[PDB]
Amino acid sequence: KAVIAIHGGAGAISRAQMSLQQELRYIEALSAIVETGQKMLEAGESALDVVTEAVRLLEECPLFNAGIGAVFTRDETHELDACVMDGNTLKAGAVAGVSHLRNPVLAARLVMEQSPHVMMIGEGAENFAFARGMERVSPEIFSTSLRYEQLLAARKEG
Amino acid sequence: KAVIAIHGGAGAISRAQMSLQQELRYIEALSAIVETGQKMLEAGESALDVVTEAVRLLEECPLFNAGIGAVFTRDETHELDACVMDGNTLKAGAVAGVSHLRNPVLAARLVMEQSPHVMMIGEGAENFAFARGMERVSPEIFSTSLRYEQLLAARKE
Amino acid sequence: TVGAVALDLDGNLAAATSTGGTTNKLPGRVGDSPLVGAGCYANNASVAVSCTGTGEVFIRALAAYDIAALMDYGGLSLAEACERVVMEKLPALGGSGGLIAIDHEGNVALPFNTEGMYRAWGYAGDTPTTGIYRE
Amino acid sequence: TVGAVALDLDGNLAAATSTGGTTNKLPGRVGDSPLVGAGCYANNASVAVSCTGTGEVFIRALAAYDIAALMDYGGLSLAEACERVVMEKLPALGGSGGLIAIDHEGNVALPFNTEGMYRAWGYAGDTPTTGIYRE
Ligand SMILES: [Cl-]
Ligand SMILES: [Cl-]
Ligand code: NA
Ligand code: NA
Ligand code: NA
């Protein structure tokens, strides 16, 4: 009775404010990622590997506010956070406030497996991941003109 | 009926290796802080102001691993964390990874009361606190010979 | 915010959550996403949970652990636990959003109190379902 | 780590926790002390808790909120909840330390599974008790 569920964010998704073409891109991205998870589960992949891979794909997808496509802070920066938890061991790994790691969920998993810690933040989390061969990236890689126009709209609001 | 408890850390404390002169230092520190809290409670002060003040005094006390007397990281630095929660509103404030704030619990109370947020980290937490008039300190003020020796002992393998 | 929960063929549960936070966030602000029991929780004895919404309220309510505690100690089903957290407790604290949850019996729930939640689910060897809006 | 919990004359509960963390932690390591429900929790309907010890296990076990949930949903007393968390569940995951707790009826508990816990408590207008060792 193996099964997967995914989400890409809850909020004020208004029908009168969306285009059909946008809705179709979301449906396609969600269906492509959930099918990858189903196929891994069917092949006997661990629940930990499955959630790790699905979140990695949701990070990579610029439509969703995680990894590439992250929202901007007040200062036009990106600060990313992630967690993974293994229900079999109750082990967990998390990062918060990271700017120079392409895939937070993979860093979170590295904290779980290769540290005696559960949570790492900021430059300390980054240095820990870089020492174990994760690539250092520019936070400009996350930036999208859609989320930038959302930052301007939020500033006009107040 | 009004009551306070405090703690200054759990761990390996053997009577065998501890001097009575040393034990009375901890007892006097703990008594003075719990009595300050008891007197604030009987005088009608909030649970929130009582736990804030007790933890501020425990931070100030160099015998306990918070504020002055904090442990060292692998790199001979201090990184401090604090939380405060109000059971009346379920509001909370927390800071993690701060090095330039004297009293993390006061910073945590500032997140609770002067932000819409629950948790702030690192230089971001520090900048938020400075913007509200909290003073900037050097982390060297937290450093003690005792915690420095425990770091050297930890790095033995 | 994005996330995933899964039950594998060996009966193991896992959860993962990732976010860029909120548009125009104060630098250094941390939401529920990286906090165990707030934005992400898994326990083979109970449930896997990944949350999305107003991070502050999900922390204050420990929403992800609250589902587990409601089932494990409260004897609530997944559906009842999800109802109580997402449609009663979070709105009462000014909280809006949703979560995805799978229990140790392979039940799945995608509750949300908002207009929308980008979401999908499927059983190993069945056809997936995707959703944006209510219904 | 240090901590305080209090019940005031108006029946309000509160908790606070502060720490340097664990000697020789990696820079950037966060323990249970700043995480709501792990190292610090207060709710007027249940309990105020502040924890100390092996932070990682207090996060994985959501130790502070677990006291509250075992009482609220499980019907356990403060004494039973403290026994269950500090003397059974924390040690099962490799955790050591303790916590201080006051419930909404003004019961107080200072459980620890270590050799010692620097601690003190007293009711308003009364003689305080101090402790380092067991008993
Ligand atoms: Cl839909
Ligand atoms: Cl004693
Ligand atoms: Na993305
Ligand atoms: Na101190
Ligand atoms: Na430190």
Side-chain angles (χ1 to χ4, degrees), chain B residues 14-155:
Chain B
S14 85
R15 198 158 135 74
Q17 288 194 122
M18 279 275 259
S19 44
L20 175 61
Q21 196 186 328
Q22 256 168 270
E23 286 159 338
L24 291 180
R25 284 194 70 199
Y26 292 96
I27 292 287
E28 284 164 9
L30 288 165
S31 302
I33 299 172
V34 75
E35 288 168 9
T36 298
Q38 281 185 285
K39 273 159 40 63
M40 287 178 74
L41 282 169
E42 59 197 56
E45 296 277 319
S46 63
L48 186 62
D49 280 348
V50 168
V51 304
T52 299
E53 178 67 7
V55 167
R56 186 196 71 79
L57 290 164
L58 291 157
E59 289 177 346
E60 284 304 297
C61 180
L63 297 179
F64 304 118
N65 170 30
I68 318 295
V71 296
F72 288 90
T73 72
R74 187 205 63 189
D75 292 353
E76 294 175 14
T77 58
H78 306 289
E79 291 182 355
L80 311 188
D81 314 326
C83 190
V84 61
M85 191 165 179
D86 175 9
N88 188 31
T89 58
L90 302 185
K91 285 177 72 187
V95 293
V98 298
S99 300
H100 298 281
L101 303 173
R102 188 188 176 90
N103 291 115
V105 76
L106 295 190
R109 182 82 180 272
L110 204 65
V111 173
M112 178 194 261
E113 257 140 29
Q114 286 198 36
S115 90
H117 299 312
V118 174
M119 186 172 185
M120 301 285 303
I121 65 171
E123 194 179 342
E126 285 165 350
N127 285 348
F128 161 83
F130 303 156
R132 285 157 186 79
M134 196 169 276
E135 287 172 353
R136 174 198 183 81
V137 300
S138 170
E140 73 200 339
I141 63 144
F142 301 121
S143 290
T144 64
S145 169
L146 172 79
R147 296 309 184 169
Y148 193 64
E149 286 306 320
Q150 297 177 347
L151 170 73
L152 302 182
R155 53 160 77 144

Side-chain angles (χ1 to χ4, degrees), chain A residues 2-11 23 38 42 46-47 59 65 71-72 74-75 79-85 87-88 94, chain C residues 1-3 5-8 12-13 15 17-19 21 23-26 28 44 50 52 116 118 120-126 133:
Chain A
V3 53
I4 175 172
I6 64 174
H7 78 75
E23 295 164 341
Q38 281 181 290
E42 293 162 31
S46 73
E59 287 175 350
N65 175 21
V71 294
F72 291 85
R74 185 200 64 192
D75 290 345
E79 297 181 349
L80 306 191
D81 318 313
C83 190
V84 66
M85 189 162 186
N88 190 31
Chain C
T1 315
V2 307
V5 286
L7 178 65
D8 71 23
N12 297 314
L13 285 168
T17 306
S18 189
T19 196
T23 290
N24 209 25
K25 189 176 81 106
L26 246 195
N44 279 9
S50 177
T52 170
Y118 297 117
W121 62 273
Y123 283 96
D126 292 344
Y133 304 98

Side-chain angles (χ1 to χ4, degrees), chain C:
Chain C
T1 315
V2 307
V5 286
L7 178 65
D8 71 23
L9 284 179
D10 295 329
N12 297 314
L13 285 168
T17 306
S18 189
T19 196
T22 66
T23 290
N24 209 25
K25 189 176 81 106
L26 246 195
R29 175 272 190 176
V30 182
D32 65 303
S33 293
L35 306 185
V36 171
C40 179
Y41 183 76
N43 187 333
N44 279 9
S46 54
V47 69
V49 182
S50 177
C51 301
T52 170
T54 56
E56 281 74 16
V57 178
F58 284 76
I59 297 168
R60 295 166 57 205
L62 282 309
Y65 192 67
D66 206 35
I67 301 284
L70 276 172
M71 297 183 70
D72 182 21
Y73 311 147
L76 274 66
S77 73
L78 181 65
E80 290 158 346
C82 285
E83 185 62 30
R84 164 88 39 83
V85 173
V86 175
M87 308 304 179
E88 302 170 25
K89 292 180 81 173
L90 295 183
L93 290 168
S96 88
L99 57 79
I100 61 185
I102 298 164
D103 75 3
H104 66 90
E105 281 171 1
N107 300 305
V108 51
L110 306 93
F112 61 101
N113 58 36
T114 54
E115 293 172 27
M117 186 171 72
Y118 297 117
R119 73 196 180 276
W121 62 273
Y123 283 96
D126 292 344
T127 65
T129 302
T130 67
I132 300 175
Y133 304 98
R134 309 199 156 175
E135 284 216 48

